[PDB]
Scaffold this active site. Structure first.
Site, mmCIF file in Angstrom:
data_model
loop_
_atom_site.group_PDB
_atom_site.id
_atom_site.type_symbol
_atom_site.label_atom_id
_atom_site.label_comp_id
_atom_site.label_asym_id
_atom_site.label_seq_id
_atom_site.Cartn_x
_atom_site.Cartn_y
_atom_site.Cartn_z
ATOM 1 N N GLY A 21 4.820 37.425 -21.543
ATOM 2 C CA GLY A 21 4.448 37.102 -20.393
ATOM 3 C C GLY A 21 4.321 38.186 -19.224
ATOM 4 O O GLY A 21 3.764 37.746 -17.949
ATOM 5 N N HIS A 135 2.829 52.746 -6.866
ATOM 6 C CA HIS A 135 4.229 52.248 -6.558
ATOM 7 C C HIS A 135 5.327 53.076 -6.645
ATOM 8 O O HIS A 135 6.411 52.912 -5.967
ATOM 9 C CB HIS A 135 4.370 50.756 -6.978
ATOM 10 C CG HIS A 135 3.216 49.895 -6.378
ATOM 11 N ND1 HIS A 135 2.711 49.734 -5.004
ATOM 12 C CD2 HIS A 135 2.634 48.822 -7.130
ATOM 13 C CE1 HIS A 135 1.928 48.664 -5.054
ATOM 14 N NE2 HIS A 135 1.601 48.276 -6.402
ATOM 15 N N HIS A 172 -3.306 46.217 -3.704
ATOM 16 C CA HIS A 172 -2.120 46.701 -3.215
ATOM 17 C C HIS A 172 -2.007 47.776 -2.327
ATOM 18 O O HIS A 172 -2.758 48.748 -2.925
ATOM 19 C CB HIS A 172 -1.074 46.580 -4.027
ATOM 20 C CG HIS A 172 -0.791 45.293 -4.845
ATOM 21 N ND1 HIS A 172 -1.471 45.112 -6.281
ATOM 22 C CD2 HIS A 172 -0.327 44.048 -4.778
ATOM 23 C CE1 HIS A 172 -1.314 43.890 -6.677
ATOM 24 N NE2 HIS A 172 -0.572 43.315 -5.611
ATOM 25 N N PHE A 192 -6.845 50.918 1.336
ATOM 26 C CA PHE A 192 -7.640 49.418 1.583
ATOM 27 C C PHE A 192 -6.835 48.483 0.717
ATOM 28 O O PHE A 192 -6.590 48.644 -0.363
ATOM 29 C CB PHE A 192 -8.891 49.368 1.241
ATOM 30 C CG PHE A 192 -9.928 50.700 1.921
ATOM 31 C CD1 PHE A 192 -9.853 51.868 1.354
ATOM 32 C CD2 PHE A 192 -10.445 50.516 3.014
ATOM 33 C CE1 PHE A 192 -10.380 52.864 1.770
ATOM 34 C CE2 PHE A 192 -11.208 51.637 3.506
ATOM 35 C CZ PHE A 192 -11.350 52.864 3.054
ATOM 36 N N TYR A 216 -2.331 61.129 9.723
ATOM 37 C CA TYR A 216 -2.711 61.592 8.061
ATOM 38 C C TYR A 216 -2.717 60.535 7.071
ATOM 39 O O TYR A 216 -2.578 60.882 5.977
ATOM 40 C CB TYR A 216 -2.240 62.761 7.791
ATOM 41 C CG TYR A 216 -2.792 64.067 8.532
ATOM 42 C CD1 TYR A 216 -2.238 64.644 9.849
ATOM 43 C CD2 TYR A 216 -4.163 64.714 8.305
ATOM 44 C CE1 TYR A 216 -2.740 65.541 10.681
ATOM 45 C CE2 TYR A 216 -4.585 65.425 9.237
ATOM 46 C CZ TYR A 216 -3.891 66.008 10.314
ATOM 47 O OH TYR A 216 -4.630 67.174 11.222
ATOM 48 N N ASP A 258 -7.307 45.332 -9.883
ATOM 49 C CA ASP A 258 -6.938 44.225 -9.396
ATOM 50 C C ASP A 258 -7.454 43.714 -8.042
ATOM 51 O O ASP A 258 -7.262 42.447 -7.442
ATOM 52 C CB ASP A 258 -5.296 44.320 -9.373
ATOM 53 C CG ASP A 258 -4.683 45.288 -8.603
ATOM 54 O OD1 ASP A 258 -5.604 46.156 -7.716
ATOM 55 O OD2 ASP A 258 -3.424 45.235 -8.554
HETATM 56 C C1 LIG Z 1 5.323 39.828 -6.377
HETATM 57 C C2 LIG Z 1 4.245 40.613 -7.109
HETATM 58 O O1 LIG Z 1 3.072 40.401 -6.582
HETATM 59 N N1 LIG Z 1 4.229 41.684 -7.758
HETATM 60 C C3 LIG Z 1 3.384 42.494 -8.034
HETATM 61 C C4 LIG Z 1 2.185 42.206 -8.527
HETATM 62 C C5 LIG Z 1 1.175 43.218 -8.901
HETATM 63 C C6 LIG Z 1 1.434 44.611 -8.730
HETATM 64 C C7 LIG Z 1 0.567 45.724 -9.043
HETATM 65 O O2 LIG Z 1 -0.626 45.568 -9.331
HETATM 66 N N2 LIG Z 1 1.106 46.829 -9.641
HETATM 67 C C8 LIG Z 1 0.319 47.884 -9.897
HETATM 68 C C9 LIG Z 1 0.511 48.504 -11.348
HETATM 69 C C10 LIG Z 1 -0.034 49.687 -11.624
HETATM 70 C C11 LIG Z 1 0.261 50.230 -13.028
HETATM 71 C C12 LIG Z 1 -0.541 50.951 -13.815
HETATM 72 C C13 LIG Z 1 -0.054 51.112 -15.034
HETATM 73 C C14 LIG Z 1 1.072 50.782 -15.271
HETATM 74 S S1 LIG Z 1 1.740 49.769 -14.083
HETATM 75 C C15 LIG Z 1 -0.827 50.272 -10.937
HETATM 76 C C16 LIG Z 1 -1.013 49.666 -9.644
HETATM 77 C C17 LIG Z 1 -0.647 48.476 -8.969
HETATM 78 N N3 LIG Z 1 -0.912 48.104 -7.857
HETATM 79 C C18 LIG Z 1 2.552 45.066 -8.392
HETATM 80 C C19 LIG Z 1 3.684 43.884 -7.940
HETATM 81 CA CA LIG Z 2 -5.208 49.977 -1.880
HETATM 82 NA NA NA Z 3 -0.310 62.296 4.907
HETATM 83 ZN ZN LIG Z 4 -2.319 46.588 -7.610
#
Ligand SMILES: CC(=O)Nc1ccc(C(=O)Nc2cc(-c3cccs3)ccc2N)cc1
Ligand SMILES: [Ca+2]
Ligand code: NA
Ligand SMILES: [Zn+2]
Length: 368
Positions: A21, A135, A172, A192, A216, A258
């Protein structure tokens, strides 16, 4: 003109499994690869297998304690690390899975190897679709990310480049990258992203950096349903102004998928052409460029997106009719490369787009 492209991929990547999941499917990297091989894109670029980045490489940013934990934690010993798991934010969104450390090593190795290749002036572009884990923080996993390959690759570029520009088109906010470089002018971060009670909760346009890094960090907050038209309204003008004011000598582009229409987690409405227009815009500046992956949860669309953006990097026109491949059934019912936007409402009015752009232009006037 046309550019030299080096591409990083390890055939083992698709085997790492976040668990039943969990929406992150490393298999999408193998689908991407197989699709672009079937379009014959391997004929126009050098394909390299990344090395497994070491603990020495990862501790150029991450703390020794966090990297030691990532090297140690396994599904079999999880019970003994209950305290450490909470400290480092591992176990829920960022689960413990078989080969987690090796997955970090392969994802990171491609980004760092790509940065070295660009520093050596041996390629114009380096591509690592397994990277872009924006992140991850110095001592904490976050949002499915454990090791921040982007921060490590930028640190590698900073050995030869006074100023590095980071651009992030994932849905994100690129929080880990912005945080790492928040107080320096040697990296400008431009993200963005959807903003408003959305993960990770940062990236307000009023977050502009601090100390030497004030002005910056650039954030363009967006609402649900942004389309190709709206994104195209602002991306080239902002990047053009950033290039003019900042004059970077290298660029890192996080291509998180995404932000596409139909994403399982995302709420945007970009097509693969709209997303790839960003790569075209950035490529036009003719600067050493590291292109990285990122999020993306409707795996058939992630594979289409990154295949098409590899073709864009190569200035190679590819047909819309998908060639046969190992994952051909994933692309039904149409079996085409390009996608249609949905009928979702675009909450980003043209006035809102122009107003946020104008506020960001005011901040860019503050650079020397
Ligand atoms: C509650 C909620 O919405 N949680 C959540 C949803 C999506 C993402 C995401 O898209 N994470 C991400 C993962 C990676 C990864 C790439 C390879 C492994 S993780 C790269 C960029 C993003 N933005 C992070 C947290
Ligand atoms: Ca972005
Ligand atoms: Na900077
Ligand atoms: Zn993302």
């Amino acid at each position: 003109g046309k550019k030299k492209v080096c591409y990083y991929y390890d055939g083992d990547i698709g085997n790492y499994y976040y668990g039943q999941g969990h929406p992150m499917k490393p298999h999408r990297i193998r689908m991407t690869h197989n699709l672009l091989l079937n379009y014959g894109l391997y004929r126009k670029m050098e394909i390299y297998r990344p090395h497994k980045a070491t603990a020495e490489e990862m501790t150029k940013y991450h703390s020794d304690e966090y990297i030691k934990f990532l090297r140690s934690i396994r599904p079999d010993n999880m019970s003994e690390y209950s305290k450490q798991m909470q400290r480092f934010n591992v176990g829920e969104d960022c689960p413990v899975f078989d080969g987690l450390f090796e997955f970090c090593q392969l994802s990171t190795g491609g980004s760092v190897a790509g940065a070295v290749k660009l520093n050596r002036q041996q390629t114009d572009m380096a591509v690592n679709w397994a990277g872009g884990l924006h992140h991850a923080k110095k001592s904490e996993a976050s949002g499915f990310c454990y090791v921040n390959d982007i921060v490590l690759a930028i640190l590698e570029l900073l050995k030869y480049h006074q100023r590095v520009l980071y651009i992030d088109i994932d849905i994100h906010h690129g929080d880990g990258v912005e945080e790492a470089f928040y107080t320096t002018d040697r990296v400008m971060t431009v993200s963005f992203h959807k903003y408003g009670e959305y993960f990770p909760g940062t990236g307000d346009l009023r977050d502009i950096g601090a100390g030497k890094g004030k002005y910056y960090a650039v954030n363009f907050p967006m609402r649900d349903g942004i389309d190709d038209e709206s994104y195209g309204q602002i991306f080239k003008p902002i990047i053009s102004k950033v290039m003019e004011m900042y004059q970077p000598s290298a660029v890192v582009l996080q291509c998180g998928a995404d932000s596409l229409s139909g994403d399982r987690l995302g709420c945007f409405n970009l097509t693969v052409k709209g997303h790839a227009k960003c790569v075209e815009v950035v490529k036009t500046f003719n600067l050493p460029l590291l292109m990285l992956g990122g999020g993306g949860y409707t795996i058939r669309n992630v594979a289409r997106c990154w295949t098409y953006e590899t073709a864009v990097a190569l200035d190679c026109e590819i047909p819309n009719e998908l060639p046969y491949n190992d994952y051909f059934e994933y692309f039904g019912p149409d079996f085409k490369l390009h996608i249609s936007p949905s009928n979702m409402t675009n909450q980003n009015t043209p006035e809102y787009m122009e107003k946020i752009k104008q506020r960001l232009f005011e901040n860019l006037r503050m650079l020397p």
